[PDB]
Homo-oligomer: A and B are copies of this chain.
Amino acid sequence: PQITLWQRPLVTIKIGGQLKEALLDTGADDTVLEEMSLPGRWKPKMIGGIGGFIKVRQYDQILIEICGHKAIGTVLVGPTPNNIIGRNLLTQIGCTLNF
């Protein structure tokens, strides 16, 4: 699809058996989801954004289906205000920016 930016670019993801909405973010290097239950092991980490730094847990090799499209990668789970699909997954479903 061609997504225009008059509205937030929000999309349905299926992650870990659960349906969620997430924002397509080219300004995020990573994918960060609000707190959820993910099966597995996770390493602690801290990311930086606009009003500071959050502590998140990373999970590697998580299957995430984004708008019907399947991708597998690292997902940071932690206290973001919104579900964020960053460029580690945006390049997997082939997404580009055009103007």
Contacts and interface: CB of A to CB of B under 8 A. Distances in A.
A93 to B, nearest CB: 5
A16 interface: no
A87 B48 CA distance: 21
Given A8-B87, A90-B99, A97-B98, 10 more contacts: A2-B97, A5-B90, A23-B26, A24-B26, A27-B84, A48-B51, A49-B81, A51-B52, A93-B99, A94-B99
A85 to B, nearest CB: 9
A91 B2 contact: no
A61 interface: no
Contacts of A53: 51
Please give me the 4 A-B residue pairs with the lowest Cβ-Cβ distance, nearest first. Answer: A49-B50, A51-B52, A25-B27, A95-B99
B5 A26 contact: yes
